[PDB]
Design a protein that fits this description.
heterohexamer, A: 278 residues, Nucleotidyltransferase, domain 5, three-stranded antiparallel sheet, 9 helices, 33% helix, B: 296 residues, Leucine-rich Repeat Variant, 13 helices, binds the ligand Cc1nnc(C(=O)NC(C)(C)c2nc(C(=O)NCc3ccc(F)cc3)c(O)c(=O)n2C)o1, binds magnesium ion, binds zinc ion, DNA-binding, Pol protein (chains C, E)
Chain lengths: 278, 296, 258, 278, 258, 296
DNA sequence: GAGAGAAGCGCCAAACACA
DNA sequence: ACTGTGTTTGGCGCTTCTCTC
DNA sequence: GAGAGAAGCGCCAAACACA
DNA sequence: ACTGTGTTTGGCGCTTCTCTC
């Protein structure tokens, strides 16, 4: 019996076929097996993409990066415009809510006033001080899923680009002052370098004629939900957990009840399709 | 009526034409501040919706849409000028004016626009009615007119010499007949855009242009408002050929006011730029008289 | 809300009218606020003016290195606790990072801007430097704005006030004559040259194969044109009714079907 | 000047083009810049592939894997035949030269006598005891480049497969004895599971008719050498080192003189093409 | 070297002759070595015989669980320090892991092989178990081989000797009658059935696009046939002169050009 | 000569033919152990090189290669048998014998081999000369002959009934005329391979085969050597149809030796397998006489 | 004289790292 | 709302240009 | 009666982890 | 000699089969 053979040995589809079974029956035996699906690290789920603004100064991404220079650790606060890619970076001695506000205001003076900003839930971004500063300027601030740095991909990539340019500059003049290098790198990135795919600079996109209006949006999502095996983003696990039913699923993540009391948001990269127990 | 994007495509163009004709009705903002508020509001909504529609769809421009769009423009803009008053005042109808300007500007830049269809709907009378609007004291109107005339000149080929002659005539009238004009700063910018695209060798008509209507433009009392643009234009002309710069400096030294005045410094500024170009090629033919005139 | 915008920035009336405020409401806000009651260059980034200003405090002094464009009035200012040639270089570099590379710069004669270090800095970027011995209006505007901000809140870290002031006079206030903002006048793309005896054709955007995000599809659904391009996405009409911003990773450059 | 502009700002090709340069000149400016190439983490070099036997029992790959079970750490010695993929695995209490020899002899009894065997330079494989045991059986033993686990890809992948099956079995019977599970998994892998690409089991390949003789080999390699930027496999580095000239380059690695006294073997994945200084 | 092979394994003469040794040399090695001086089943893995043997040591005892196929004589033995039903199950599982799944197994009546646990183990694998109350030649061969190995080296960990003995009697020694080795007789694929009124066509190998390893190429150089397939590579003739084993990652399944 | 892979492909086939004819020379190993050592060594090298060549190239088999390859086989194998001697001895020419066997086996399995070209070069005389070699006392030769005859029977279609009649004749001669035969174990394996490929309904010729030459094969004194294979064959026959099993057991009970002998147990073994198949389908027609005969 | 090398130029998938 | 992304790089196809029989 | 749903089956690129 | 690899998986194209106007 293919069912008994798989229950004893957990052999694959081609093994079950030769002992007598059609491809569909062996395939259903594999699909209905909980042990196989909890322990196979493979899964096939869609990819998510960060939310991008409809026009300049609509959505921004911010992050803090460490840089080592002259036995001193500098904290670079970086803001990137999700439409044009324009970068504002400031170097500070430490990470603090006051420094976050100062860097945001410097970015506003450099680029403009953004409608929304989103950052990972860092200690200096969830403070009451930062929320009050954003609210006084009518800036709506949202946060990401914890322990998922890929949800801020654009700003992290910009951190890499900025640090690479800084290393290139310091390779020539080890005695070059930090602010000189940062200013030259910012000028190079925004005014000199050309974006790979649109063949235009960041500054050209940022000050392009705003004549094209904002395209309309739609808040309608899928009205159905499924069962999911899952892994918690914070702690990596060898085998999946669940399965459990999703309260609601957005484009890029879902609500999974992790325990009997609290639910949580999990991205599609840590979810695996299950089968309905009924 | 109904939203243009919520109807079948078979009659969508008909609804677009209906909304286009719905903007043909005029509204007076200067007569009284409060009159037909909801009519103005729905007109603003219709203009915004139409311009949002036009720049997100392709293959929507067809022959039965070409003429009356211009008509709508002619209905909204070609009109008698407000009385002169010599900070400048702003037109009370500016909301709808800005909507129609931005709509026309995006319409003229549509990738589906064909330049061979407007040759029977946009003619010299439209050019005159558009150019006469440059006298407006509203800087927004002048900026939009600059960015509109530039594209019209660039796209069309059979209406270039006519615009050049018309701007020569308006320069003559401004410099000789009537001094009252304020759309002079942007016209020189458009001219500089045209001059920069010249080839070699230069045509003698351009020499007539500079020697008749461009250099004499310095003897106007109101040069202070538009000193840089004019200067830019000559720098955009002499760079093509350094041989034809001697008449320029010869006339420039003659238009210099022999008496002390605050206006002198601007002249010096111009000379500096010319100097920064005239030093090479061994140009010392008029260096001595220039120094003699500068010393006094 | 224009009232909060004024109470935080103390900008001009044209700034309020550009927002939801009306002329009479803007005037009311003006007279209800207790605290508020030539172009020698030819092109943007052609000639700059560099000045050093002293900011007076109750028990300390600040040095403001200010660079102003002589075509748009665009202001780039940095605050320092001292003054030397290297700091002048740093301020010039920051001004370049915000505005761009100037062609010529102009300034007074002094210990800074005349040393060999500053000359070396200017020569490496190919900037011609001219010196003279004797605009001050921009300095006055900045001084009044900083004083108003400090009067509103004496407990400011002397950095946010400067950033807000630059934002106000660059992006919010409107130049009276041209009725434009300094930022928009400075960074507005200029009219392209018009070639003679050659029609100015319209640039054609390329064609792409695309995939719908969030579907885990693997077959590219036909080639289409792009309405707009930006950093990280392109506006692709998915159907004849709506359009969507598709990321580059889900796009593949194609050839026109002809 | 494009050369001066790049020397100051290190801008990209499209930036250098607009300041006046042909694509070739800007491309050569970028190629000849040392700072750009030492600091860009990108490189384009060929891929290597482990050496595979010409027939069954020609080359084997071995490795040790840890497994956790009943608060006890078991050491699985795994041997894989590089031609057929046949697996021999034995579970021991510790890793020792004696255990290595015992596992090798068990594998020989299970599968046969191999001509050559290669393993990573583990502590229990480089001992004199193991070399003497291999020499007594006329087994030639070679080792891999240190700190490069990918050079033993087949055996590491087999470790993953074996552990996945073990977890599947223990998911049902937590009280199942270890040797029972290992024997069932070995039977499933060698006799039941089917290889993905050749559509045959490992045992079918291992005992297939040996009628096809060994194809001939060629020891001829490339007679030319180049300059290379490099990174040391043991210690990761942000930026490249060098460049230096290769003493000789084989198919998959090269000799790079790391210091003035000792040279070393570096795989193609940690090398970057340079330009001749003369 | 056959001399070293005998001195380590003490195999038969046919084993030496299969290697470089000659008949007279093999006989000389035989008489120079001081220590050396029916089929009831129908198919392989059809009927097995299970026996338990006691190995005598100077101060301890070993239990050998031995399973022998009744068609090829293939031997699978495990050594234990005790004996019970679970250990019988473990030995059967190891024998299956080396040889395969038998159809029927045969053994004596005793505390093991008759308990409910062993019956449950056999039923889960669908193996029919029959019991009888009374081959012993295989036991004798194994005993002599272990004694010879221990005499050669008294300091053996009692595991390597068993592994070497199994290797010798399975892969090295040659059965006298059929002149084959036990391993080769056991694992030799059998003659496929011959369908009636239908020609036995030759199986056709598929066609692949391939790339040359070590070149960083990106264009697949045409489709070709495969001479041989194995785990991890396929034999592809790169030219009309030589062939190379190309890995699967550099291969792409194709369709015959027709 | 020269290596086959080191010549241009234009004349490579010619060199292959030359090496093929180079193996037509015979060498005697039984006459004296040492004679023409280097000739034998180069013959071994040539055989190994040719077989290594044939299995790594495609489109090398062509019509002018088809006949004489068989000729080479006929030159090396079709010969008088060594005198009978009743451990069995091994042929002294086994090295070259194994090389030529493996060469022919790989040649017959080449994917470029065409079964429609050997119909004019391999005929019934080749079949007889190949089958007569099954009497050899060398087990290696018998194993190779089994694996060769199986493929020849499988590939060809017009030579199947002839082989069946020939094996029936050899069974008759072995069971009645001469008892001296030792190639009986492998022949039954080939038969079982053929039987397993039968269809439904069974032909009456196969019934004649079992009732005439298969069941009587039990009354031979030398059944002990080939007891299992024969048994396998009948299990491969009665599984197709359980109705035709009664004659099998009826004859099986008659061939049972009525006296006590060690040979009895094998008979019982066969019955067990038959029992394991005969219990279903309510087969108790001959259960009582079978039990009566088993009791005695 | 003219078609074959040679330089030029644009495009791209795989790798890489952002705590 | 929740959600990965932008730049570097040897190889390739393709176009333009020059030295040779 | 017959073409449209529906089930069946084989193939595959991207992800994954092997300390 | 030095050198990454084999299995899982939802989606797709393609073939075979059944219920309906
Ligand atoms: C809750 C909570 N508390 N701590 C965490 C947490 O897990 N975050 C770690 C990784 C320290 C972290 N990481 C990054 C980051 O950028 N990672 C580098 C990267 C970027 C992209 C890519 F694809 C892979 C890696 C941040 O920006 C950051 O703020 N944090 C806090 O979650
Ligand atoms: C010298 C020296 N001393 N210690 C090292 C050393 O760097 N080796 C580490 C990683 C502990 C190591 N690792 C693996 C292993 O398999 N890694 C898991 C993996 C496999 C494949 C793949 F692609 C990525 C990761 C081993 O087998 C092993 O023996 N060692 C010693 O080098
Ligand atoms: Mg962060
Ligand atoms: Mg980060
Ligand atoms: Mg290891
Ligand atoms: Mg490992
Ligand atoms: Zn399972
Ligand atoms: Zn105020
Ligand atoms: Zn560089
Ligand atoms: Zn011996």
């Amino acid at each position: 019996s293919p069912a008994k053979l798989h229950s004893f040995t957990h052999c694959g589809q081609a093994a079950l076929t030769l002992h007598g079974a059609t491809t569909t029956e062996a395939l259903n035996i594999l699909h209905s097996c909980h042990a196989c699906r909890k322990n196979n690290p493979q899964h096939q789920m869609p990819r998510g993409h960060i939310r991008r603004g409809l026009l300049p100064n609509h959505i921004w991404q911010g992050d803090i990066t460490h840089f080592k220079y002259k036995n001193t650790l500098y904290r670079l606060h970086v803001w990137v415009d999700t439409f044009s890619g324009s970068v504002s970076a400031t170097h500070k001695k430490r990470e603090t809510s006051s420094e976050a506000i100062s860097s945001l205001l410097h970015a506003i003076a450099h680029l403009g006033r953004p409608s929304h900003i989103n950052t990972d839930n860092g200690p200096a971004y969830a403070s009451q001080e930062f929320q009050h500063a954003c609210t006084s300027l009518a800036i709506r601030h949202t946060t990401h899923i914890p322990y998922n740095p890929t949800s801020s991909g654009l700003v992290e990539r910009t951190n890499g680009i900025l640090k690479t340019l800084l290393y290139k500059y310091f390779s020539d003049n080890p005695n070059l002052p930090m602010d000189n290098a940062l200013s030259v790198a910012l000028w190079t990135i925004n005014h000199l370098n050309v974006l790979t795919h649109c063949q235009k600079t960041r500054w050209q996109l940022h000050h392009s004629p705003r004549l094209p209006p904002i395209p309309e949006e739609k808040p309608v999502t899928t009205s159905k939900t499924h069962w999911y095996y899952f892994k918690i983003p914070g702690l990596n696990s060898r085998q999946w957990k669940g399965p459990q039913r999703a309260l609601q699923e957005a484009a890029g993540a879902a609500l999974i009840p992790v325990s009997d009391t609290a639910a949580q948001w999990i991205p599609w990269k840590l979810l695996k399709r299950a089968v309905c127990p009924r | 009526l109904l939203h243009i994007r919520d109807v079948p495509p078979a009659d969508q163009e008909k609804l677009f034409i209906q909304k286009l004709r719905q903007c043909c009705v005029l509204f007076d903002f200067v007569s009284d501040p409060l009159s037909d508020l909801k009519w103005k509001e729905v007109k603003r909504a219709a203009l915004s919706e139409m311009v949002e529609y036009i720049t997100h769809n392709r293959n929507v421009i067809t022959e039965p849409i070409y003429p009356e769009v211009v008509h709508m423009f002619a209905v909204n803009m070609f009109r008698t000028l407000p009385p002169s008053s010599n900070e400048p005042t702003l037109e009370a109808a500016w909301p709808h004016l800005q909507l129609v300007y931005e709509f026309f500007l995006r319409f003229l830049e549509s990738p589906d626009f064909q330049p061979n269809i407007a040759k029977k709907y946009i003619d010299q009378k439209f050019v005159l009615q558009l150019l006469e609007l440059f006298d407006s004291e509203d800087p927004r109107e002048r900026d939009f007119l600059k960015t509109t005339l530039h594209r019209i000149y660039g796209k069309f080929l059979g209406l270039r010499a006519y615009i050049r002659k018309q701007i020569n005539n308006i320069f003559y009238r401004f410099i000789y007949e009537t001094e009252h004009h304020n759309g002079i700063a942007e016209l020189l910018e458009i001219l500089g855009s045209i001059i920069n695209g010249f080839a070699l060798p230069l045509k003698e008509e351009h020499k007539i242009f500079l020697l008749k209507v461009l250099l004499p433009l310095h003897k106007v009392k109101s040069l202070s408002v538009y000193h840089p643009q004019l200067a830019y234009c000559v720098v955009q002309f002499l760079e093509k050929d350094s041989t034809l710069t001697e008449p320029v400096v010869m006339a420039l030294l003659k238009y210099w006011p022999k008496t002390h005045s605050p206006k002198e410094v601007m002249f010096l500024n111009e000379l500096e730029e010319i100097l920064d170009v005239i030093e090479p090629s061994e140009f010392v033919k008029i260096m001595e008289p220039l120094f003699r005139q500068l010393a006094k």
